[PDB]
């Protein structure tokens, strides 16, 4: 396998890890804050997916400093992973076009 393809899967594994720990930490950070809704694990994991993908429907979000910090790591991991897949798909097409040009 090629590097870019390795980094892709890697980012996918790391992202799944960030999503899991992210859901766990959000609950830990949010419980204690009156009015907080990101306080049970199942929905927190859903929240983490809509954060990593940037869809952010707005049905769930952190209201605490530490929950927001956790949110940032998740957004950055998501944006970075998905952007890394784009870059991998780009390197793949560029190589194929090189062959197709007999270069």
């Amino acid at each position, epitope marked *: 396998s090629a590097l870019h393809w390795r980094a892709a899967g890697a980012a996918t594994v790391l992202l799944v890890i960030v999503l899991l720990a992210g859901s766990y930490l959000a609950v830990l950070a949010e*419980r204690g804050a009156p009015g907080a809704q990101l306080i*049970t694990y199942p929905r927190a994991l859903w929240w983490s997916v809509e954060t990593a993908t940037t869809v952010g429907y707005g049905d769930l979000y952190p209201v605490t400093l530490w929950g927001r910090c956790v949110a940032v790591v998740v957004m950055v991991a998501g944006i970075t992973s998905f952007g890394l897949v784009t870059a991998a798909l780009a390197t793949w097409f560029v190589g194929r076009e090189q062959e197709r040009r007999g270069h």
Partner: antibody, heavy 118, light 106 residues
């Protein structure tokens, strides 16, 4: 088998303090939270606070005066609630309950009857 | 902090009839409401979770419905063993809260 084991009772002198225990068993997940609920005779249930043993973090009901302190012992699977400077208003049954981090109390202890008296 | 109102406080029904306990939330809480039964001297027991999901070991006679701010716990054909206090509890927003409870009287 009984999943939460609590001592049947505790007598306490006004001003003194007591440390209630709650030994757990059955399935345990680092994601579990142990809650404490207070029920004065003839009254309803009142949430006191919660703790997650795997991290030792604890949260308390803000609406009521804080007379509790939660700690836990990961090795013996035991949750502790330290009640301090008690008065007759603190006389009641104190239950502990396990929550899998999904919002509801699947299991409860039999409760500890605490009496504040000389 | 979400306020849960359980009214009436006492409910009287004849044997075998269908009974309904009410629970209203001060704000919208989806379906994050749970029901417990507490008999005299006993400890609370989970009956229904998330407004309508049944718990194993609980008679099929118990059901729940509702969403938003209004919720109902029903018992099809009540019987002596159902005599007890019933509480609701929300987990939508921190901190979790309980209703004042409703006594069933036959």
């Amino acid at each position: 088998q009984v999943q939460l084991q609590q001592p049947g009772a505790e007598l306490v002198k006004p001003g003194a303090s007591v440390k209630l225990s709650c030994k757990a068993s059955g399935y345990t997940f680092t994601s579990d939270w142990i809650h404490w609920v207070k029920q004065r005779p003839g009254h309803g249930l009142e949430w006191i606070g919660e703790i997650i043993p795997s991290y030792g973090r604890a949260n308390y009901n803000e609406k009521i005066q804080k007379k509790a302190t939660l700690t836990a012992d990961k090795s013996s699977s035991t949750a502790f609630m330290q009640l301090s400077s008690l008065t007759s208003e603190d006389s009641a049954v104190y239950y502990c309950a396990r929550e899998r981090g999904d919002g509801y109390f699947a299991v409860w202890g039999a409760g500890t009857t605490v009496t504040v008296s000389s | 902090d979400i306020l849960l109102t359980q009214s009436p406080a006492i409910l009287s029904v004849s044997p075998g009839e269908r009974v309904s306990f009410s629970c209203r939330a001060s704000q919208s809480i989806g379906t994050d409401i749970h029901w417990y039964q507490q008999r005299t001297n006993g400890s609370p027991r989970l009956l229904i979770k998330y407004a309508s999901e049944s718990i194993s070991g609980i008679p099929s006679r118990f059901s729940g419905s509702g969403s938003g701010t209004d919720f109902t716990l029903s018992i099809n054909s009540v019987e002596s063993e159902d005599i007890a206090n019933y509480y609701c509890q929300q987990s939508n927003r921190w901190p979790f809260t309980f209703g004042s409870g409703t006594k069933l009287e036959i």
